[PDB]
Design a protein around this ligand. Structure first.
Ligand SMILES: *[C@@H]1O[C@H](CO)[C@@H](O)[C@H](O)[C@H]1NC(C)=O
Lengths: 311, 98, 98, 52, 49, 104
């Protein structure tokens, strides 16, 4: 089954967090990048974001994604979801908060999606390197060669023993909850939620209300309002304010965990070998920087180690 | 390779908090006063300077540590074994680990 | 030491007592931004993987081949081997019969 | 950074572009040669083209 | 010789008799894939350039 | 005339062949790449693919391309046919199994 992998992700919601680059400037992004894992060999990277992928309001659907649009969570079909480092990356799979991509080297990681006429992107500075397997520094997985063991992030969504914590969301500041109304600030409370408020006008007031409340202050700037909605949990993000008390509510498995795999590495051209008295002459014509090592088979190995980059 | 775990910071509006030690590897904690953070919904705190953010961080083993790690060993004299292939007279080749 | 091979140490890959030595330092958050910035020494395991040098597999004298399961050095052509083999009495034929 | 600068737009089914050879360089400000604006660090005076 | 200036030789540019000396070696196809992999020494003419 | 350049290509069909990085994982692609020629000076390269460009079942039409969908050949109008190496390449022209493009 596929739904068995989303039992705990259905208990978490997407969130808006600070993004260092929302296009040209910093903003609070619904696709904010939390972490980029790029320790796999053949250019595979795993990106954690604040958006949810694979879930819709009616259940699991890998063609749908969900993100926050203010205080309201929105669910749309995935439209031009993309990842870029130095050039477009191929997407392998996605799971709640997580994207698995096949990327070229680069100095940044860009993730974004489309919502009708809207465009949401987030770019972070992160050195992405291509890590070849073996003794040859190839720059793209070859069509053929020698198959070597390698470290890869698996494409499977299964729970494989790695987890992250989901916590009760902290206070969410939202000044749109306040309205001057009849020259007297009113607090609007969304259904099912509670709103904490703090006003410091001549009549200093604070508290938590579960219904529309009118305070003694006449200017919205004199008050603060916070939305309390714990029906869905969020990742223990370092870019979100913490709640009060013990906010831990559950665990979320990490889908695309690192695994051992077999990668195809390049195989250098066969050297030309010439023989002289007690001398081995090798003519090396590499395609990529290729490591050459030698050692004597006697009591003194006299090892030699050098990278051959040109003939 | 290590991973750094960074819990949600504690943002105290119109007040202050204090750091405590914790049993975490390379644990760090510091309270930064005079912050005026903004969220998607506007200014988070009311006071202009009487606000603090308490940041926390500690080191963890990364997910790759289960497959990509180096093992440090103490090496002592052990045993020596060999595979020996033997034939004699009209008896065909036989071998065993010795 | 931080940034060197042993900056992160664990007695076993599944232990719950981890040693970590990095210059993890919390930095002040940027003005108006809720986040937890920090600086830290780049992992010394990644550094070591770059500067490992030649392994024993490539420098062992006497033509040794290094294997890991179990850790061992194969086919090292050092010295000599005393031997003693007891041949079955049925394998011998009398002189007058040959 | 790049060796060319390409600009273009669409007009229905038509695409109009123009590419010129021009070396674009990233210029970190300070005593560290970073390759992309950091999320955090030390704020230093710099030269920018205003958005106004 | 392979990888050197004269690895590929022809008496004329339209000659039907061509001499070639490269370490062209056929490699085993990848498992389950129909293709003809090989290794070869990079051209010595491009190397000479 | 233009039809005289396709007299032999009208006798050939596209095919499906192995592509090492078809999509994000090796698969049999209808536009598999057979050859890349990159020995020209000003960054111009010629790519041979398994797809047929400029031909439709009803005749020659440079706005159309044909490719194999399983056992069935389908002819479609070209939709965002593109080439890239490190960045988008400008297409020069296409003919039969070949694509001409200027790449960085
Ligand atoms: C022993 O020697 C024979 C002949 O040399 C060979 O066929 C056989 O495989 C050898 N056994 C082993 C275990 O190498």
């Amino acid at each position: 089954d596929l739904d068995t992998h989303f039992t705990q992700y259905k208990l978490a919601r997407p969130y808006i967090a600070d993004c260092p680059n929302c296009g040209h400037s910093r903003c609070d992004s619904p696709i904010a990048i939390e972490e980029v894992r790029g320790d796999a060999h053949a250019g595979v990277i795993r990106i954690q974001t604040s958006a949810m992928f694979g879930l819709k309001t009616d259940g699991v659907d890998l063609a749908y994604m969900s993100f926050m649009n203010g205080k309201t969570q929105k669910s749309i079909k995935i439209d031009n979801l993309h990842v870029r480092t130095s050039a477009p990356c191929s997407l392998v799979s996605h799971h709640g908060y997580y994207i698995l991509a096949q990327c070229p080297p680069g100095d940044t990681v860009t993730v974004g999606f489309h919502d009708g006429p809207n465009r949401h992107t987030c770019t972070v500075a992160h050195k992405v390197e291509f890590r070849p397997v073996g003794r040859e520094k190839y720059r793209h997985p070859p069509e053929h060669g020698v198959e070597l063991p390698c470290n890869r992030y698996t494409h499977k969504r299964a729970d494989q023993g790695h987890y992250v914590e989901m916590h009760q969301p902290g206070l969410v500041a939202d000044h749109s909850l306040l309205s001057i109304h009849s020259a007297k600030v009113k607090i609007t409370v969304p259904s099912g939620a509670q709103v904490k408020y703090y006003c410091k006008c001549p009549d200093v007031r604070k508290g938590i209300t579960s219904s529309d409340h009118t305070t003694t202050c006449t200017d919205v700037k004199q008050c603060r309002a916070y939305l309390i909605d714990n029906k869905k949990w969020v990742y223990n993000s370092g870019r979100l304010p913490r709640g009060e008390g013990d906010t831990f509510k559950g665990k979320l498995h990490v889908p695309f965990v690192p695994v051992k795999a077999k990668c195809i590495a390049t195989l250098a051209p066969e050297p030309l070998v010439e023989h002289k008295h007690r001398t081995l002459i090798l003519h090396l014509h590499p395609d990529h920087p290729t490591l050459l090592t030698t050692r004597s088979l006697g009591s003194d190995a006299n090892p030699t180690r050098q990278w051959i980059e040109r003939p | 390779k290590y991973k750094t775990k960074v819990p949600s910071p504690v943002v105290k509006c119109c007040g202050a908090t204090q750091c405590t030690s914790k049993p975490h590897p390379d644990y760090q904690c510091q309270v930064f006063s005079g912050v005026y953070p903004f969220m998607y919904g506007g200014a988070y705190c009311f006071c202009d300077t009487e606000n603090t953010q308490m940041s926390e961080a500690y080191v963890e083993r990364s997910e790759e540590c289960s497959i990509d790690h180096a093992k440090a060993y103490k090496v002592h004299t052990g045993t020596v074994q060999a595979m020996v292939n033997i034939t004699y007279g009209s008896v065909s080749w036989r071998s065993a680990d010795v | 030491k931080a940034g060197s091979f042993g900056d992160l140490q664990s007695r076993t890959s599944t232990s719950n007592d981890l040693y970590a030595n990095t210059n993890l330092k919390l930095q002040r958050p940027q003005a108006g931004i809720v986040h937890t910035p920090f600086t830290q020494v780049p992992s010394g395991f990644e550094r070591w993987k770059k500067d490992k040098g030649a392994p024993l597999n490539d420098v062992a004298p006497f033509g040794c081949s290094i294997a890991l399961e179990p850790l061992r050095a194969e086919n090292c052509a050092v010295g000599s081997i005393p031997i003693s083999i007891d041949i079955p009495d049925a394998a011998f034929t009398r002189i007058s019969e040959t």
